[PDB]
Design a protein around this nucleic acid. Sequence first.
RNA 1: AUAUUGGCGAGAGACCGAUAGCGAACAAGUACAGUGAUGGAAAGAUGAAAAGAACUUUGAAAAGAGAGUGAAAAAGUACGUGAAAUUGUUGAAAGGGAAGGGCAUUUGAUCAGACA
RNA 2: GUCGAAUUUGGGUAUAGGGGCGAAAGACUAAUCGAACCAUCUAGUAGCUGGUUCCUGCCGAAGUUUCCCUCAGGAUAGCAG
RNA 3: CGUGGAGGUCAGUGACGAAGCCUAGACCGUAAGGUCGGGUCGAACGGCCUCUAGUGCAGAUCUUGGUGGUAGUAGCAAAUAUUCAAAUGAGAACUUUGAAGACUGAAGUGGGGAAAGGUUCCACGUCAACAGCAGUUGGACGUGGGUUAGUCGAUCCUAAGAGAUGGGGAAGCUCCGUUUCAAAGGCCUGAUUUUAUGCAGGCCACCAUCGAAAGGGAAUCCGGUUAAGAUUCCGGAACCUGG
RNA 4: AAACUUUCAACAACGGAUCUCUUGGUUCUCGCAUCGAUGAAGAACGCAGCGAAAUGCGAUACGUAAUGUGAAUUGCAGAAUUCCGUGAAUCAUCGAAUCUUUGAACGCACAUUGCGCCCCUUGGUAUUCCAGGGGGCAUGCCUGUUUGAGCGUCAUUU
Lengths: 126, 119, 71, 50, 206, 56, 87
Amino acid sequence: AKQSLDVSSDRRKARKAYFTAPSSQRRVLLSAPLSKELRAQYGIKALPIRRDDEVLVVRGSKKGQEGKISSVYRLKFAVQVDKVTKEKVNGASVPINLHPSKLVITKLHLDKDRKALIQRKGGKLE
Amino acid sequence: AGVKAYELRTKSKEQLASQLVDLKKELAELKVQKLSRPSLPKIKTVRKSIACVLTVINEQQREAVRQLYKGKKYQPKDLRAKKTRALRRALTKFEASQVTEKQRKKQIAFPQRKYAIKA
Amino acid sequence: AMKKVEDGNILVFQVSMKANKYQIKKAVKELYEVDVLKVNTLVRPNGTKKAYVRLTADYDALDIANRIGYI
Amino acid sequence: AAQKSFRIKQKMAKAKKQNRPLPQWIRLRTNNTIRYNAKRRNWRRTKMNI
Amino acid sequence: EKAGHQTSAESWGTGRAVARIPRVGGGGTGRSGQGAFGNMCRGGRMFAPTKTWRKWNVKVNHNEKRYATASAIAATAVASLVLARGHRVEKIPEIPLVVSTDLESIQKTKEAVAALKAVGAHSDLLKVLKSKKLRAGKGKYRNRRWTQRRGPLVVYAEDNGIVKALRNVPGVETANVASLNLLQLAPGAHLGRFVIWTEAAFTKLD
Amino acid sequence: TITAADRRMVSGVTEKQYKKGMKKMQQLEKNAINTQIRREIKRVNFQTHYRDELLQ
Amino acid sequence: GKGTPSFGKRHNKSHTLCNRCGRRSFHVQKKTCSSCGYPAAKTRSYNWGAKAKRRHTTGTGRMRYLKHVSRRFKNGFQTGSASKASA
RNA sequence: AUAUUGGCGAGAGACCGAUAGCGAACAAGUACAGUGAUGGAAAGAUGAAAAGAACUUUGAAAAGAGAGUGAAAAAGUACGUGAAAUUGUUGAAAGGGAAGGGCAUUUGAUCAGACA
RNA sequence: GUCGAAUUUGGGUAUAGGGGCGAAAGACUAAUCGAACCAUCUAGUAGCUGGUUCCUGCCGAAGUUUCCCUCAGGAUAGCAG
RNA sequence: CGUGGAGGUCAGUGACGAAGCCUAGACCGUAAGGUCGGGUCGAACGGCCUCUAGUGCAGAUCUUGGUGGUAGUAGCAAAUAUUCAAAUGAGAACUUUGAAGACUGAAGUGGGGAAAGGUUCCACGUCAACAGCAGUUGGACGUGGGUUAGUCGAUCCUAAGAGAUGGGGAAGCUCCGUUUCAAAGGCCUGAUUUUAUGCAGGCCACCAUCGAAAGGGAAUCCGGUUAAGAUUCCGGAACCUGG
RNA sequence: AAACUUUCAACAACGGAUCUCUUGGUUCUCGCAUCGAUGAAGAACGCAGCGAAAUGCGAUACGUAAUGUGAAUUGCAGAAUUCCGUGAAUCAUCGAAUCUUUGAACGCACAUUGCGCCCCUUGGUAUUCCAGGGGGCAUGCCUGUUUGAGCGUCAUUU
């Protein structure tokens, strides 16, 4: 159980922290797990989602599908994969808000900073 | 777009004054075009640029004044440390440890000593 | 407004509240290059000030009106 | 009162510019609690008391 | 203690044909004219507001407090009262259950649980982990949310890493001979927990 | 000019929703005005000092 | 006569807008605001006003200055500026 | 060492659970009332997700009626569950200045248990 | 009824609560006047009126003594559990 | 017996449907109440040995909220009064135009302002609500546009009064008083032709400020113009003040 | 015999109880010392590509700089090179600035967007009139400076 006196077990405060988090605090909340493919590759488990990652849906009605994130939507705690969508009655298509804890990242989008991210965390990266 | 702040610092005082008369004519153009069309989102960065030039103009002069009051008493009140009014009364560290020469001897003669209890 | 510009040779501006008829007559000459007979002002009941600037007969407000992009 | 002081007239103009309903696009926003304009004032209902 | 009294409410008296409790004065709002200050009124104070000088703790004679924890210790023998709490003891070799002291030096949670099972307490280790249910009250948003049963209690004379080893494994608690809480020897005031005595704790208990 | 109807277009609203949307605002006010007049008529006619023109 | 016919003669404002609290408590003939107290140096309040304090105390406005003092305290009332690291 | 119903930052409970808990869980000292000092509320909840009803027809329209979305419209922005007063429809019975109750059995409707 | 004067009335102004003002009626002082209005002391005090929330079993009264500025109330004894 | 929470236990029940609600359906109990069936419903909850309390309602001219009977009833009756046709519209006793008939009768039911309101003015669209009938009309609803000054007002002056200063009381909030027991101030130019203003004689003693859109007061008229502004805008003809 | 009244169940109404929730309250414990003439607390008026209010801000107006993180904001439009980068963002952090008219509020007033004066600079054929621009002009008290007042007072002298 908890030891430190600086951290809270209060359910009211946890749910207050979560729903009130600013954007830069939510980026860490939206971490998604890497595949059995990549975690032997990059030696790392999860990463904060980014807009261009390629991803596979491992839970829900959309299970088994895959695509590339269109927009990471941080008000809704949602990520929008294109190739996962639902069509309205009048033909306009609408995206399916997914929660990245239910996804798996197949291919990363690497920058200097993203390379630096995997640096700190114990990776190797080719 | 918008100006970058660190690229302006290199510019001289009187270039920026010319830079800023250009950005002002821009709005007088972009506020005429904003009543001919429904929306004109471009007008945001041009008036947040005028604030990025005025920040550097004013930043230069204030550290041109820090240099001509440098290293001497009585500099204008808005260049002084701010702190808080209770902490600007606040006898300075030099007027704190001020001690009469009587105790100054007493301190030196009998200061507090370190010791321990074993054997 | 535009019916005076194209008729009575009068430019109609939204001018700042702090400005008086001396500062207006001076900044019309400076920005738009013109010469002014007369300035009349009123504070609109949204809380802003309107100016009726009547250029001299040496000019045509219609000629300058469309130079800054409205007409 | 047909011949006015500027501090009054400046307060008539602030109440003229709050006199409009909600803009519609506000309702469409995520987590919107707001429904209608609850502070609408009317010269036939509540006098603003200067 | 200011709750409900923040109002200025006078009784309207009589003769206006409504009950005589104090009515909020004023107008134009719709709070105005409604009863106040009573315990029978909406928004008024309660009957007998609770107050913090209610006696909370309780003194118990230190000799009687000791009288109880020497019954709760004599009650962890006598197998029949252990079964009456649960505590599947059917498989255990005998009771009291005295383990070699080396259990006090075990450094790891993985190594500790392997020891309790090897002793034969696994039956009661499973009684927990099967029993976790939500709380049936409003105490679920008061941070009491999850409930469960109480596995064995381990008693050690000297601590080396054994308290942190077993602290994660659910429902299982550890105490020193020198302490022996009653709250941990008779939960709910029901005697006879199943206690695991280390050797050095079972001599020092004398 | 831009005929503020057109502003509503660009803003992400339709000249259709502007009816369906505003008529839900037009009526939802009444449920304030119907909840005020209902609770109101109970205690409003209570009057502090009333002379009772004659009683005998 | 003391009722609805007399309520018709009532058009002249006794009070006008106050500059300090802007509440229209300002009395025209006494030249005094009956809420803040202007033009008195001190701000009118009373310990029997327990609500009417809670209305106007500090924290019910913008706090254009005090807002930042607790932040500015924990740092030590620093001056100068931060330097840099990387990335 | 002591005091602290303010301030800042934290952790907690055998506390209240939207008529309760602060007056205020919501754009609450807010809307509103008064000349003023002052007085001062009401107001939480679709769904996992708007996927918030395209398309057809009658009607001037609101909507209706079908199809459609959804695990469910017995969730349609009057939206979780949806009680009681009270009401409309259908069915049953009753009725000579009230109605309603107790004991008793007949008549009508219903109910098991049991046997076998 | 009175209607050229002890007239009628607008605005400015002065007088504020045991105070003001009154050609006087205890009149008027923001529908409040034999002491205004608003908040606190205040959940003022009441020997006086009203109310006091589930079952069932066993037992079961008193309106009388003495004293009290005591007589719409208490102490005391008696009856009762 | 029942209710809201706490400790224990039944390795209790539950999206294969918890809780709740409706149920002249069944069972147990002397009773408070408990157990089951069916219907609606959707995420939590009980039995028992114990702990604790903001723990049980039919009334209090009880609090809050909702709703009845009365009842399609009381009434929607002052200010003389309307009618035909056409146009619009889905719809006309009520909107619009014409035609009639009337009325206020200039101490007006007209043409303008003061206090007060604050956008009610004007245009276009729209008719859910409001207009105690109706409504295509609206002082409503949604969107817009509109108030132009050297001369008109304020601004200035003082009235009745208010109110700093100097002082004087008062534990103090503040009170007295308004030129008062006050060292209360800046002018007119001569002296200067190093330079501008030293030094010069004389003076003048009223010595804050506030206080009137009806009192005092520098000066503007005619004609035309707008959907809505004009002694302000236009054209013309004047005038005042400071320099 | 219908209507009608009344009782009950069904489905549907009017109404919002009940149950289940909870980014709020409430009480107790722990740590901390931090408002303002260097203009506070409060007030008014303004600021958005489309905002009425709430939160944010001040004509640099939902923010400017700086710093960290490292690719959004999102109702729609938009921006895209700003995407292996001195760099997205209603982001955190915040040390440098801005800070309208006011307010202890200070040139004097203030029911007025009234009325001054002084110094520097600018225009109009102007040291004096008018305009524009920048910096000023409160009271009490303290230490010092300079200029003074008084047969209060000591000398100097002629």
